[model samples]
Target chain A: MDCQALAKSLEQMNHLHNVKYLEAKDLTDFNQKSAYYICHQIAEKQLSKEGGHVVIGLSGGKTPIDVYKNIALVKDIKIDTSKLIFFIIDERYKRDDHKFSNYNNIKFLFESLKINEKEQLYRPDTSKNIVECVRDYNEKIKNMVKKYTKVDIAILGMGSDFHIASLFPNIFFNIYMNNYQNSYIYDESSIKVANTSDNDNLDLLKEYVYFTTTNNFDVRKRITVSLDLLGNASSKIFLLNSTDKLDLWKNMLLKSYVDVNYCLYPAVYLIDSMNTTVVTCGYTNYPQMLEDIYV
Target chain B: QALAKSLEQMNHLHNVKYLEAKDLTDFNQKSAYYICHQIAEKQLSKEGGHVVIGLSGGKTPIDVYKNIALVKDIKIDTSKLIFFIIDERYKRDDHKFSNYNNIKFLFESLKINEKEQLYRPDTSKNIVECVRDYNEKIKNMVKKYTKVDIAILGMGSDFHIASLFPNIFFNIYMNNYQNSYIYDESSIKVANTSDNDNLDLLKEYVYFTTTNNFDVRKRITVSLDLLGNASSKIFLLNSTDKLDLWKNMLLKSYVDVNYCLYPAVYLIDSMNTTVVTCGYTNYPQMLEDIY
Candidate 1:
């Protein structure tokens, strides 16, 4: 499907009302265009009486790289970046310079957008003492949730292995769920490998971590957010396109048990019922490509 | 190795890795303890590996789950692992309760992550799509593992493994294609002497003489071809009561012995096979016996 079709399908979901689809032929140009679009949205929404805050959860994927550039282009108004609390979904146990680290990506985006560094933006420090760092971040999440019921909106990319946040397979790490509120990690099996090249180790598989609550929790080692919070969110979106495995994901979501319970995080579950849109215009496998053929 | 010794050996394997299985006469409280012991050992290890178990639904296994709740180690790691039912009854998710509900008890007991690694095929949707998604999940899993070191099989007296009823596949589809449900022409002689009545019933008990029942449908068992390709070593565990069947099936006929004996035969037959059986009540001294 092309951008228009993706826009249409996303719009078809009842929950997603003010959804928008953006398409780009290449990453570099797309980033430029996306920044332009995002800045306009933020400024317009913030000016409206309904807009209390425009919070964005910074993600570490290539797709989000350009979105940062796009969001930073709003130059005229001295918008309170402090009122907007920016949080990251996950970070690697590595230094900021590491290629996979979210730190550099966030830094690059903010720099390009020229947002002041001190405005309500919080990031977990990698070099800090590991224990203390975790404790501090936990406090940060607590404080953030105290002010806002949930992260205003979250943007995400899809992983080949159905993982979002740091929730790896076979490791139950949700803290918000009624059952998991008391614990940090749930043990289903002991075959989890913390570090792997592609992070695919089925024999050494662990339960996927589903953080139970977005409202409270500091950090996730094995944590993943519950679908309840994600599904109930005001806005949620997954920026992904078609691939060989797209059909599998689509098929999984076709059924309640498979779709509603399996992949439903607030981000996904809310897409079908809430105001969330999945925009795939610039995505490699836009659904429009198959218009002429019949399945 | 001898039966007693083999069980002990398998137990030792459990001490070192999280991937180990213990076959019990009744999948009761004791079975859950055995499962928990390994789960605990792996969790405390330095590498901090995670575990995911694909459970088979049976009256006995459920008993084990009840007792499993009592173990502290299980309580600690209950959510650490991912639970996927090996296979669900082919029906709706809401069909007055199914394996999905029974398995839900495990998740309810433990704090699981948000829906991530867990998967169940939708019975309400088209069967083809369900199978396709299930197959995709399996393929992805197979691709993820470099090698499957341990695969546990519980054999009924009839010698059926998984859903593969000895004669069901043969009765259904006929093709020499490794996974197809046709009987291998060479395997016919061995099937004749095999103790599994299921095979005999399929051959003698049920017959629609008008149409060839053998070649029409695919066997429901995990394809030996796929298992052989996926697993470096295969464990065939049968308890003491089933020993008579093992002797009859593995030691009786020339063709049977060959099919059961040579690991290379599995390779040739499209499976890399190693068979092990337990339940030797005769002598503890024979535990080391391999031949």
Candidate 2:
């Protein structure tokens, strides 16, 4: 009921008109429909280009594991994979072939379709040091931007904190900003992306960045395409596995810019962006849905 | 030593902290102090603000509740501190199994005034009406306070958190909880266990009806998000006999709550969680060794 209520409430909110909201019947249904939707988006892009390469940004996590699996099994939609070029949106700083690697997870989708991994995928070469890896990926992204007008589409998964890709509200006080502190700190009062003010921005981070994790997460290191590249993808699909997260994401996205609170919720960057659709399913708690999701 | 490994892994994944207590008395004291400290911090941050807590009922929490009432010179204002029962049985207020009756001593010790401030279900009514009315109060409290300050819970043998027992009822009900058919005409109210049980004749007798189908009979509890969204959560795993049940919570993917039979683990996905235990004596072999 809260899910329906969530759908009904979102339907009436004209501010969210730019982004389409899809609520699936079940987890399997969510996986199937979202997979189909991605193929549809790709096919549309593929046909319009009349055979040009279509680029896509992808996030790696538990939520997308089955969605990509469903993508491989999509029977109704004929996805012409020969012209699709994929790039990692965010990655756990691990070797490309490592079991925990985000590239390896999405590698299954191309492998299932028997597509050429070498030709189609772009990921940070973790063999290099973290700094060099960021510089290289940044150069590749800049070069790709020089070649293409815009990214064809991007698929993102949200953390319960409403962080998209790896743009955590907390940033390395020294590396990403000029604070020169040893670790990350969060400033609830600042709305600057990563909450780093005008004086704190790093040039390498304008497109691609790398940082180590704090006590909040297990993985010590991480990397991601900059939020600017992701928010403005020609098409965007945000996936959430549970309504627990959706409620958190909705609360931040529905507010005005001053109250959008990117300081805490980096996912709010997509609220003002275009060509976005939120695909979601499942419920963790009804009372929370009743209390927070609708209002 | 292996227990220690699980604790480290849990901290790495879920932002959980484990505290090992000396004994039941020590567990009660630590639990009491933790609850009070969380409340006091919130009170100081927002002076004169109401601090609402969602607390579970059971033997393990009774002593801790008593200890909380006895804490000397507590920083938080008692008048502003209020609590709602996390789960309740369908029994009269004074019944032994009733959470309100079992935990009533704390209300008297804190001198909580007014029925609405410290609310529980009027369980004298039927179970369906009781849950609906109690859910309304839960909604209203969240409205007044914005969010619950903390959830103090006791995990049962089945790893049930609050009264959401791990069974077909919860598995089926929570899975399709948002469907429109399970709703009333206004759609504002939701379906309780009984309303969603057209297909569960045997399941109804076990959960909704008044038989000894299960140990505690019919029950009412808040939703997983209502409890999970609390700013903090303190779980008491103090019983020596349930040590194995306590150990099972340290599973891999500790933060995943999808169709989870172990509802206790689901609450750890919250921002902050602490597991307090006095369930071990062979300290070297327990999770306490590394801590």
Candidate 3:
């Protein structure tokens, strides 16, 4: 009843469609429930698909660290691990061992699941020029969707900064402005700017991958799947658990019926999807916010 | 986590508090809240007396000023406050890049008369005369207010705080970066030890100097002696690229010349209370790694 009300309110007020919501008991439950949800999706796809192969999109952050571990140490299900492929939705341009490396954190689990890192786990080669890196990955994703049609399921984590899968506010803002200056956007406005089109469309560009560096710093570099490609997934699971992210619901997620500005709220990427579930332990209490306040 | 262990062991960081915010607005709001809270507290204790503040130039301060104005229900007595520019770019007061131009927003919004309440360097005069006048002004302010209640600052990529860049000055016994001077093997009179004196090293308390720190060549910043003595120090840090340098800076030996190059390290040593708020994602990762 609680989650339905939350989801229904968001769908009606915000741009989201068929918004699904879940409130985990706690962090321990967050890991278990999200892990089970992922496995069930994998299980359903394995039984239904002719080839019995499942391509699952994965995101990285501290919140999902234990969730990955939970998936590796699952119980009650004897499943074939060989038929699975792991896709890194977004990753940094750093050594595999680098702390910020999303691939390195999930490498052990991918290897244990018998998913070949070279052929099965899709990642951007940090050594190549950013343009080449983006092109190669886009070509690969293009080939991936050709047969599989779309990713089976995606497990994403919403960053404290209200970013999802490395689709940062400043980066997309700069991309739309054609400024391409990878730096911080200090001047923020509530006005409906960056609305290049009436309807949000990431597919119009045809580019499925992006090499983003939104600041002057060296290691801020990232290779992220476009919102178009991410939304192309059959379903998405957003796992959020952070003290600071609680205000995201007020400040952005449940906006006051404003036009979806992809630059400000990049999670507007989920609006076009049919199935999007948000699972969380914290940030459950929906503080009532007035519409006029956001204006 | 190894870096967290290093930060945990730093004795100088014992009194400092680390705060995290998810985005820029939150960062600006919280910092502004702290400043206002402290000001109101001082006003209550002193019974409507003046609360002096040392402010710096940057985009954050402007937003902080906006936050200060936007905060509802908090009745701040604008008249019972004195604003001091901790540092200024060597330009006319009306220049776009002038520190005063950025700071005047706070004064303008609060309807505080700039001539009476604001103290900044006068760029119309020669650099020496301008530096001297500002020096006397701050000295008298210190005598009048007893101390600067708060210092709101932004750390540079290289950790330069308030235009205070670390360098082996040619002259040892000169007033530099508010109050302290660096005299070492690189100095004109080759010193045996790195020196940080509050009052002995300088004839005056402010300086108009050149720093290889950033693009700006000529700047006027308070000496470390003055800025270091502020009652509270609040540093606003942003950008993810600076995480590595911040960690390396906190871990490095205080006496290292490289560490000395970043004057921010020096300012933290003497402050009554120091608070650093970082808005980047790396701050969270660092905390997770530490625990």
Which structure among the candidates has the greatest TM-score? 3
TM-score of chain B of each: 0.54, 0.77, 0.80
Off by over 4 Å in 2: A1-17, A95-97, A171-205, A212-217, A251-258, A283-295, B1-291
Prediction 3 global C-alpha lDDT: 0.61
| Deviation of model 1 at B268, angstroms | 18
Pull out the clashing pairs in model 3. B177-B222, B177-B223, B177-B224, B178-B222, B178-B223, B179-B223
Q: B90-161 in candidate 1: lDDT tens per residue?
A: 543344445556656766666566276465555576444455456565555544533222233444443444
What DockQ, on C-alphas, does every prediction get?
Answer: 0.02, 0.02, 0.03
Query: What is the CAPRI rating of model 3's predicted complex?
Result: incorrect
In order, candidate lDDTs are 0.42, 0.60, 0.61
Query: Model 2: clashing residue pairs?
Result: A1-B178
Question: How does residue B35 of candidate 3 score in lDDT?
Answer: 68
lDDT of 2 by residue, B259-281 (tens): 23445555665568787767676
Report the Cα lDDT for candidate 2.
0.60
Model 1 chain B poorest 10 in a row by lDDT: B204-213
Clash count, one per candidate: 63, 1, 6
